Amino acid sequence: VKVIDVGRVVVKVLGREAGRKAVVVDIVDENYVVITGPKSLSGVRRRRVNINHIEPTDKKIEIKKGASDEEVLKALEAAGLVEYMKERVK
Amino acid sequence: MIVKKVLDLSQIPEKGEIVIDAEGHIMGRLASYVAKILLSKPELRVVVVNAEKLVVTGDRKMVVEWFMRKISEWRTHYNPEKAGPKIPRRPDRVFKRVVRGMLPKKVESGRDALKRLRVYMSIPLDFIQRRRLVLYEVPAAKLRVRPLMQFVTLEEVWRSIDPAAWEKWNKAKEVWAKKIKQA
Amino acid sequence: GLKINRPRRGSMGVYPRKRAADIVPRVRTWPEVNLGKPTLLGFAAYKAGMLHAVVVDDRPTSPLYGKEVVKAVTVLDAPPLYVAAVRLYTLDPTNGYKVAVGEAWVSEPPADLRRVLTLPEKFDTEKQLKALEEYRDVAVDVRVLVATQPRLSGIGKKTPEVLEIPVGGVPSIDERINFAISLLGKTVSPKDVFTPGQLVDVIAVTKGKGYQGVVKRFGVTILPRWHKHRKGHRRTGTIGPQAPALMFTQPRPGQMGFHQRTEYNKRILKIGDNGAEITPKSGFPHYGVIKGPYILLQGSVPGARKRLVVLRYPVRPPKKAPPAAEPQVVWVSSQS
RNA sequence: AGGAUGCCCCCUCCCGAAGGAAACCCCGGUGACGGGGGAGUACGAGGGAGGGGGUCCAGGGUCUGCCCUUACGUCUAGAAA
RNA sequence: GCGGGGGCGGUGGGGUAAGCCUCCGCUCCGAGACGGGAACAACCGAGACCGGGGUUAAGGCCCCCAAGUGCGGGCUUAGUGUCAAUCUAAAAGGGCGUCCCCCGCCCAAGACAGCCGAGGCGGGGGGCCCCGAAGAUGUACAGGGACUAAGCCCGCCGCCGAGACCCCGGCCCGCGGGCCGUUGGCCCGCGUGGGGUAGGGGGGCGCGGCCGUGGGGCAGAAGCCGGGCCGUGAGGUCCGGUGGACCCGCGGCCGACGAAGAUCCCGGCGG
RNA sequence: ACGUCGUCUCUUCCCAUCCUGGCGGUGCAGCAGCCGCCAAGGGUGGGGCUGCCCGCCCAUUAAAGGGGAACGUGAGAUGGGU
RNA sequence: AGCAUCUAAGCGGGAAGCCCUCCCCGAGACGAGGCGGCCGUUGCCCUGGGGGCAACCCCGGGGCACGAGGGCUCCCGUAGAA
Ligand SMILES: [Mg+2]
Ligand SMILES: [Mg+2]
Ligand SMILES: [Mg+2]
Ligand SMILES: [Mg+2]
Ligand SMILES: [Mg+2]
Ligand SMILES: [Mg+2]
Ligand SMILES: [Mg+2]
Ligand SMILES: [Mg+2]
Ligand SMILES: [Mg+2]
Ligand SMILES: [Mg+2]
Ligand SMILES: [Mg+2]
Ligand SMILES: [Mg+2]
Ligand SMILES: [Mg+2]
Ligand SMILES: [Mg+2]
Ligand SMILES: [Mg+2]
Ligand SMILES: [Mg+2]
Ligand SMILES: [Mg+2]
Ligand SMILES: [Mg+2]
Ligand SMILES: [Mg+2]
Ligand SMILES: [Mg+2]
Ligand SMILES: [Mg+2]
Ligand SMILES: [Mg+2]
Ligand SMILES: [Mg+2]
Ligand SMILES: [Mg+2]
Ligand SMILES: [Mg+2]
Ligand SMILES: [Mg+2]
Ligand SMILES: [Mg+2]
């Protein structure tokens, strides 16, 4: 089963930003979540996304619900995932 | 050894033979992909193994009754061997018949395509003994398992409509289990 | 439908009524019997003729219990069977089919077997048995290949009949294999297989009657008030409705007889060693004399008067078995 | 009796109607996808020029594969009937 | 020609109803090719000179079958159902089966159910499904495979797809203009020009003879068998073989002038 | 120009079930009866009367159901009626 | 849905009906099957063409021999319209 949780690093599999990495920062409902690249980092804008269009990775950072990009970027440093985000899958 | 791969629907080879492991696949959805592959690659041979692990969605009683009606009520009053239907029951023959229904009818290209398909229950020993056996899956034809969903396997259907024949095949599996396990 | 209800004319369970593919019965079913020792599950014998016997009824609940009753009996001429080969069977894992995995032959088969088989001058039996042993652990069934010895029968022909008879009696496959191998090159007499008073099934090709009309073949009625009908009376009226057209269930003339049939639960009344005690002084009509062992069966048996008949242990025995004691045959009609 | 100054293949070159992409960069959308650039480009019916190689081409008989396809004449609103 | 027919509309009027009878109007079939509708004159799309390229229409895009196992939300558990009509179906009624909307009342934690502690009772309606739901050669028929979505509802994105529309080449036509001694021929321009039964109008091919004119033939006429070339075509012409004495081009004129069919006639000859 | 009633013969299909299998209700004590549901594998016969079909009747019977197949079947019969 | 409820998940029982068991046909079952065994897997002759000609080799046609197995002819009947 697919599990999407706040802080999880995910990969987008649909849309122009396909193959890019992103961080889940909020939950809208059972079907949509909010992800942020951060944009300056991986090229993913801060938008809602349907769960069907993302796949979870094995990496997770710790943040609060609705975390800002700077808070996300800082948490990406305490985990050392900065170069993990710039890599494009497939 | 057995190597499991995902079949690339755009990177099918034009020659040779691919082996598809049918376990966990929906029968009609896998048949649709298999039928298209055989027509679009007129030189490729397709082998389907584990045909008894194909899944038919729906209530078990509903699926079994559908098969019971097919093998019982569908008949001819003319010479039965010359003019009537001959309904398959075994999972490998059942699945091959399903693919036939998705191929062009009464033409050579439809006939040639079916002759390029082989379906097996479980994995034949000669395939197992190979140094490197590549088994493909077709994820779009795989069953997405959800709670409270009803489905049956072609093996359970066969057991329902031909118990003595299923028992012999089941016993054969037990008899050769040690040698199959060795290979 | 019909104007007045009545059952259909003849069975469609024997469709098609064609000539048997072989004059020798080919048995599809062999029962699983627990006898406590290994043994052949069947025997083959030649039908010699029919008589009648005075038998004491031994069924305690029967209304004729203890009385002498006259029963029609069939005499089988049963020279010993010669065991020529042992064959092993396994199950094909792909489909569960029973498949032969090998067989071991006697080194020096009798010269009469060469009338039917393409054999080498000598079989190297020890190698064949060695190869056979490799398949012991996947064996599910073992059968012997037996040849009849028609020279020892009243027919006197030389060409033998060859068929497979399984070994049963115990559930253990290994003991059945060991017993079957011990039989290679030896003969089997009817007393080695059956015991007097037991029930057997009989399988044979029935007597041939050639091309026959629909009245005899299916029992359709001769058209009533027979003289009234133009174009004959030994016929059906119509041969079908308008639709569906001639169906396969419509009675039609054709071959009658020479089919393989199975009859159940025939009691063995006596297994004799010397047929001179049962052969009538005139001989068996159209058969000859019996000089070796014979089997006396209660009732009738399918087949013409020289047909090879296969007896097997019953596959539909009744709930209550016959009495353990041998039946008392007081007198047979071929005697003084 | 037709062409053999042919036909076929390859390569190169020129022109080209209607129409006409892609990789990739940028903007939007959950997304299938849209838009700016790449680009009226690559290409595109056909029309011109040359070079290398081969041997028949057209036409015909018959068979196979794929696609299409409900004998004729007639009265009739209506014919495979 | 004075037999019409289909779709839709006038609750047309009649009739239990009818692929029913009888009016009124637009369109289509008859007399209209082609794409879709499973097949199918008249339902949808659309009007076809010939060849080729391109783009769309109706409709479709899991396989059969070209193009999506396309995107978001919700519903159904009955294989219900599976994108209008011809076309193979369903009613009154029952169901909190399940999803949802509204109203009235009780509970201010002393409500409902048998002290406990938080929601509870009733009414009205909507969606899908279940029962109501029974037939005769052969399977959950309504294209088949099969599908739990490849079903249904609210929306959305791209693509495929005709002879239509666009383009190129060729042809023909109507009308107008011009040239040539012309019972006719040729050239140019324009056309939101190019389907067609009955019928009307215009031109050509072939057969037998006649009036002229020009020729061929024993070094081989007509006829016949097979073949190449020319013409949209009727047909013309040439070649090889066979044959053995007549025949043809061009202009004009005339007919005992063209056959696939008549339970056609006569002869011959089949299964 | 599709041989016009019935019957005979012969085969198959439907189920809205008369009996046989299963179950329930009853104003079901028992013996019987009545009513509903599932179920079409098998059975549903012999005679009298009439050209019949239908129907009435007789003796039985577990019961002696009803329909479709070009009003199944006349290049199979019969030919009593029309 | 604090109770209750055969049902929503799960489980037990439950028909002459369905499937298997049983009988018949059966590998043209074109995925045309399994097993054991027997045989062949060779030569010579005549003639036409081609290559280099020095043998030679390749190809076309025919004939003969080897060879398991099969048939006709013969005497018959467990069989039978042929
Ligand atoms: Mg067959
Ligand atoms: Mg008569
Ligand atoms: Mg020339
Ligand atoms: Mg008419
Ligand atoms: Mg009419
Ligand atoms: Mg016509
Ligand atoms: Mg009129
Ligand atoms: Mg009208
Ligand atoms: Mg008309
Ligand atoms: Mg159509
Ligand atoms: Mg496709
Ligand atoms: Mg109504
Ligand atoms: Mg349905
Ligand atoms: Mg026109
Ligand atoms: Mg003239
Ligand atoms: Mg005509
Ligand atoms: Mg004539
Ligand atoms: Mg004749
Ligand atoms: Mg007629
Ligand atoms: Mg007729
Ligand atoms: Mg007639
Ligand atoms: Mg019923
Ligand atoms: Mg009739
Ligand atoms: Mg008649
Ligand atoms: Mg008739
Ligand atoms: Mg009369
Ligand atoms: Mg009269």
DSSP codes, B43-93 = TEEEEEE-GGG-EEES-HHHHHHHHHHHHHH---SS-HHHHS-----SHHH
Instruction: Enumerate the β-bridge partners of residue B2.
Output: B133
Distance from residue A29's CA to nucleotide D34's C1', rounded to whole Å: 27
- Measured between alpha carbons, how far is C145 from C104 in angstroms, rounded to an integer? 10
DSSP single-letter state for residue B141: G
Tokens of C129: 């048995």
Per-residue exposure over C49-61, b if at least 16 CB sit within 10 Å of its own CB, e if not: bbbebebebbeee
Q: What is the resolution of this structure in A?
A: 2.0
- Helices B60-73 and B154-161, interaxial angle, to 10°? 50
* CB contacts, 8 Å: B89 with chain C: none
Tell how strand B2-6 and strand B133-137 pair up.
Answer: parallel
Q: How far is CA C97 from CA B83, B117, C226, in A?
A: 28, 22, 55
Q: Nearest by CB to C93, which of B90, B166, B172?
A: B172
Distance from residue C128's CA to nucleotide E246's C1', rounded to whole Å: 97
Q: Confirm whether any atom of chain D, the nucleic acid strand, is less than 7 Å from CB of B106.
A: no
- Measured between alpha carbons, how far is B164 from C261 in angstroms, rounded to an integer? 24
Q: How much distance in Å is there from the Cα of C242 to the middle of ligand 6?
A: 29
| Count of Cβ atoms closer than 10 Å to residue A31 Cβ | 10
- Measured between alpha carbons, how far is B4 from C21 in angstroms, rounded to an integer? 50
- Measured between alpha carbons, how far is C175 from C167 in angstroms, rounded to an integer? 10
DSSP single-letter state for residue B115: H
DSSP single-letter state for residue B25: B
User: Do the Cβ atoms of C92 and B172 come within 8 Å?
Assistant: yes
> Which positions of strand D lie within 7 Å of protein CB atoms?
27-34, 64-67
Backbone CA torsion sign across C147, C148, C149, C155: negative
3-class SS string, chain C: CCCCCCCCCCCCCCCCCCCCCCCCCCCCCCCCCECCCCEECEEEEEEEEEEEEEEECCCCCCCCCCCEEEEEEEEEECCCEEEEEEEEEEECCCCCCEEEEEEEECCCCCHHHHHCCCCCCCCCHHHHHHHHHCCHHHCCEEEEEEECCHHHCCCCCCCCCEEEEEEEECCCHHHHHHHHHHCCCCEECHHHHCCCCCEEEEEEECCEEEEECHHHHHCCCCCCCHHHCCCCCCCCCCCCCCCCCCCCCCCCCEEEECCEEEEEEEEEEEEECCHHHCCCCCCECCCECCCCCEEEEECCCCCCCCCEEEEECCCCCCCCCCCCCCCCEEEECCCC
Whether cis (ω within 30° of 0) applies to the bond prior to A38 is yes
How many Å from the N-terminal Cα to the C-terminal Cα in chain B?
Answer: 9
Q: How much distance in Å is there from the Cα of A60 to the middle of ligand 14?
A: 78
Q: How far is CA B44 from CA B4, B14, B19, C27, in A?
A: 20, 6, 11, 44
Distance from residue A28's CA to nucleotide E122's C1', rounded to whole Å: 37
User: Do the Cβ atoms of C96 and B122 come within 8 Å?
Assistant: no
C161, C92 contact by CB (below 8 A): no
Chain C residues 209 to 228 whose Cβ lies within 7 Å of strand F are: 218, 220-221, 223-224, 228
Secondary structure element (H or E) that encloses residue B4, with its range: strand B2-6
> Which positions of strand E lie within 7 Å of protein CB atoms?
62-65, 69-74, 77-79, 137-140, 144-150
DSSP single-letter state for residue B27: H
Whether cis (ω within 30° of 0) applies to the bond prior to C16 is yes
Q: Nearest by CB to B165, which of C96, C138, C140?
A: C96
Chain A residues 23 to 82 whose Cβ lies within 7 Å of strand D are: 32, 45, 47-50, 53
What count of CB pairs under 8 Å joins B to C? 53
- Give every CB contact of residue A3 below 8 A, 6+ residues apart in sequence: A56
The C-alpha angle B156, B161, B166, rounded to 5 degrees, equals 60
Task: Please name the residue whose C-alpha is nearest to the C1' of nucleotide D33.
Answer: A15
Q: Confirm whether any atom of chain F, the nucleic acid strand, is less than 7 Å from CB of C242.
A: yes
Distance from residue C30's CA to nucleotide D51's C1', rounded to whole Å: 84
Polymer length in residues for chain A? 90
- Measured between alpha carbons, how far is C203 from C200 in angstroms, rounded to an integer? 10
In the three-class reduction of DSSP (H, G, I as helix; E, B as strand; rest coil), residue B12 is classed as coil
- Measured between alpha carbons, how far is C144 from C47 in angstroms, rounded to an integer? 23
- Measured between alpha carbons, how far is C222 from B171 in angstroms, rounded to an integer? 54
- Measured between alpha carbons, how far is B172 from C138 in angstroms, rounded to an integer? 9
Tell how strand C141-147 and strand C162-168 pair up.
Answer: antiparallel
| Count of Cβ atoms closer than 10 Å to residue A80 Cβ | 8
Distance from residue C333's CA to nucleotide D26's C1', rounded to whole Å: 115
| Strands, E assignment, A1-90 | 8-12, 21-27, 32-36, 47-50, 54-60
C8, C2 contact by CB (below 8 A): no
- Helices B154-161 and B163-175, interaxial angle, to 10°? 120
- Give every CB contact of residue B144 below 8 A, 6+ residues apart in sequence: none
Q: Confirm whether any atom of chain D, the nucleic acid strand, is less than 7 Å from CB of B163.
A: no
Q: How far is CA C295 from CA A15, B125, C43, C191, C215, in A?
A: 88, 49, 11, 9, 36
Q: How much distance in Å is there from the Cα of B115 to the middle of ligand 11?
A: 21
A69, A46 contact by CB (below 8 A): yes
Q: Which chains touch C (3 or more CB pairs under 8 A)?
A: B
Secondary structure element (H or E) that encloses residue B153, with its range: strand B151-153
Give the DSSP letter string of A39-59. HHHHS--SEEEEGGGEEEEEE
In terms of Cα–Cα distance, which of C201, C182, C172 is closest to C34?
A: C172
- Measured between alpha carbons, how far is C110 from C94 in angstroms, rounded to an integer? 38
Tell how strand B133-137 and strand C208-212 pair up.
Answer: unpaired
Instruction: Enumerate the β-bridge partners of residue C288.
Output: C284
- Give every CB contact of residue C60 below 8 A, 6+ residues apart in sequence: C323
Q: How far is CA C323 from CA C195, C297, C299, C326, in A?
A: 12, 16, 18, 8
Tokens of C144: 């012997």
Per-residue exposure over C196-218, b if at least 16 CB sit within 10 Å of its own CB, e if not: bbbbbbbbbbbebeeeebbbebb
Chain breaks in chain A (C to N over 2.5 A) after: none
* Measured torsion, CA atoms of residues A77, A81, A82, A86, in degrees rounded to the nearest 10: -160
* CB contacts, 8 Å: B173 with chain C: 93
Secondary structure element (H or E) that encloses residue B119, with its range: strand B117-119
- Measured between alpha carbons, how far is B28 from C195 in angstroms, rounded to an integer? 58
User: Do the Cβ atoms of B77 and C247 come within 8 Å?
Assistant: yes
